[PDB]
Design a protein around this ligand. Structure first.
Ligand SMILES: O=C(O)c1cc(-c2ccc(F)cc2F)ccc1O
Ligand SMILES: O=C(O)c1cc(-c2ccc(F)cc2F)ccc1O
Ligand SMILES: O=C(O)c1cc(-c2ccc(F)cc2F)ccc1O
Length: 569
């Protein structure tokens, strides 16, 4: 009995949660009520199995069981067999579910709902997040849950809860968003590019954090980790949670053979342990390390070893280069690595392999410098323009590159693109390029998935599917789409009403930024000079109409003077 197996291992609490999560992630439209129902029905069935490990259908796989229970409330999909059925659900997850924004009631009401019924208050939190982020890292979600719990438990019995809770709740919303992004990138790697891509990443990333670990150790960690994520991304939430626990055990037992910063971590609760380990800082770089050139370019056995076990060889390359380079970003390392592989591929087929791959490290020089330059700049522009204007600039810029992309997606992706600026540009010259180029891969992945749903720009497709590591470089190359046919103006699209006045300070910027998009889609060839100039008139008018007697009509009148002056420029 599989269900029985996992249950013992996870216990009722987590098992219950994981299953709630898996359901909210497969049927994001269904109400809370119905999920909760099915979860209980399933949980009790599991109980009967622990005992009689041969009762009803304790023999069946998780999918069959989970699938049949969802099929009692959903159709094509359910009209299928396994694994076909299961794959169906996976393909129908919505990365942008049409769901109501989530508004939080006043502090008082929350604390009351929390104190009265705690389990419910938390089960609904898990539900509202699982359904919106169908790819959120299950295990990690439970961790956020606890942290969420501790938030209320502590703030609801203080002097000023509003002052105690609201902050901790924001810090969580953000970090929870950052978390979802990363895990999304992760699933994307595996699903669109295969495990070979995910592994390479893992090797480089781990090697950077565990410099003292042995290649053979890393590979093992890498092999396990993959399986963990390969499962979660595929919806095998229970086993993913199980295996992820194992891994945390193993790492803790073999501490000395891996890293010396893993002490603090292994001395705490399961959920807090895994979270801790996953975010441990890089161990101190081993002192006397030979030169890479030695075993990787000077040696004359290069092509021999490469042909023997191509992957392990490259796998070693990576591990070697990475471990002594925590100042490099995982993608950059991956590029270099990919460059090396290409060199060996063409060189090992030459008369004198050695001469050919002799200067491969000269090839690297350009690659390391480009990212460096780009950031040095844009962060020099961030320090100047400020966050908002900086997002605007990026807005103009990306719209010009891929005009087809839907206004909403562009606005979103660009706002995020601009946060990277606030996040990375504060660090020192040295720490700038990593932060930025790795974050950019998370964000740009956002653009890629949202777009994959309803493709409209071949230029976006190519850049997203050609190479995972090269994405940022691909998009940066694009300038303006010369074949784009400019859009014709729509009255409705540029009509500002008074309802924008009630909207928060940000929701406004969001409006103005959505306007700027439409403008550019209308005037591709327009210039940054004109655009700024025009943006000024608008600002000058929201203030007017919004504070001018009983006028829901100044929106039609003041807006007329707007479009008029707008059609002119
Ligand atoms: O589930 C996870 O996200 C996870 C992550 C790690 C991990 C540890 C250290 C590191 F630099 C990267 C990691 F992914 C190790 C084990 C693990 O289960
Ligand atoms: O073409 C570009 O100039 C460009 C720039 C960025 C970018 C965003 C935020 C930042 F702080 C630095 C950047 F380089 C991200 C993507 C991109 O295409
Ligand atoms: O899209 C990509 O950039 C990509 C990259 C790799 C890869 C191969 C070898 C290597 F040393 C590092 C890599 F990232 C493997 C698969 C892949 O799709």
């Amino acid at each position: 009995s599989e269900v029985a197996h996992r249950f013992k291992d996870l216990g009722e609490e987590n098992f219950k949660a994981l299953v709630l999560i898996a359901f909210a992630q497969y049927l994001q439209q269904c109400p809370f009520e119905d999920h909760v129902k099915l979860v209980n029905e399933v949980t009790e069935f599991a109980k009967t199995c622990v005992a009689d490990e041969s009762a009803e259908n304790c023999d069946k796989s998780l999918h069959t069981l989970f699938g049949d229970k969802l099929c009692t409330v959903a159709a094509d999909c359910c009209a299928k067999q396994e694994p076909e059925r299961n794959e169906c659900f996976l393909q129908h997850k919505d990365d942008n579910p049409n769901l109501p924004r989530l508004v939080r009631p006043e502090v008082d009401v929350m604390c009351t709902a929390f104190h009265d019924n705690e389990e419910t208050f938390l089960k609904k939190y898990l539900y509202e997040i699982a359904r919106r982020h169908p790819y959120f890292y299950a295990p990690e979600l439970l961790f956020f849950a606890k942290r969420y719990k501790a938030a209320f438990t502590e703030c609801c019995q203080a002097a000023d809860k509003a002052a105690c809770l609201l902050p901790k709740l924001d810090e969580l919303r953000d970090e929870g968003k950052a978390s979802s992004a990363k895990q999304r990138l992760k699933c994307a790697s595996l699903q669109k590019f295969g495990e070979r891509a995910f592994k390479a990443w893992a090797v480089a990333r781990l090697s950077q954090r565990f410099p003292k670990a042995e290649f053979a150790e890393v590979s093992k960690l890498v092999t396990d980790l993959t399986k963990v994520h390969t499962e979660c991304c595929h919806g095998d939430l229970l086993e993913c949670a199980d295996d992820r626990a194992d891994l945390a055990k193993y790492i803790c037992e073999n501490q000395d053979s891996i890293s010396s910063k893993l002490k603090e971590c292994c001395e705490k609760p399961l959920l807090e342990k895994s979270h801790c380990i996953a975010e441990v800082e890089n161990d101190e770089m081993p002192a006397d390390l030979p030169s890479l050139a030695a075993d990787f370019v000077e040696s004359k056995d290069v092509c021999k070893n490469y042909a023997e076990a191509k992957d392990v060889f490259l796998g070693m390359f990576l591990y070697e280069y990475a471990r002594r380079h925590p100042d490099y970003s995982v993608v950059l390392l991956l590029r270099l690595a990919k460059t090396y592989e290409t060199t060996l591929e063409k060189c090992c087929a030459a008369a004198d392999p050695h001469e050919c791959y002799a200067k491969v490290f000269d090839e690297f020089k350009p690659l390391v410098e480009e990212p460096q330059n780009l950031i040095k700049q844009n962060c020099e522009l961030f320090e100047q323009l400020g966050e908002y204007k900086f997002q605007n600039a990026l807005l103009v810029r990306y719209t010009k590159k891929v005009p087809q992309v839907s206004t909403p997606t562009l606005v979103e992706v660009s706002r995020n693109l601009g946060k990277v600026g606030s996040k990375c540009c504060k660090h020192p010259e040295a720490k700038r390029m990593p932060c930025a180029e790795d974050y950019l891969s998370v964000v740009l992945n956002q653009l890629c998935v949202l777009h994959e749903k309803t493709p409209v720009s071949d230029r976006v497709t190519k850049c997203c599917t050609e190479s995972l590591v090269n994405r940022r470089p691909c998009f940066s190359a694009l300038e303006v789409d010369e074949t784009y046919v400019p859009k014709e103006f729509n009255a409705e699209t540029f009509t500002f009403h008074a309802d924008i006045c009630t909207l928060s300070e940000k929701e406004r910027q969001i409006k103005k930024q959505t306007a700027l998009v439409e403008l550019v889609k209308h005037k591709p060839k327009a210039t940054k000079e004109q655009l700024k100039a025009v943006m000024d008139d608008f600002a000058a008018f929201v203030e007017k109409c919004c504070k001018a007697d009983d006028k829901e009509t100044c929106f039609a009148e003041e807006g007329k003077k707007l479009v008029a002056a707008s059609q002119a420029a």
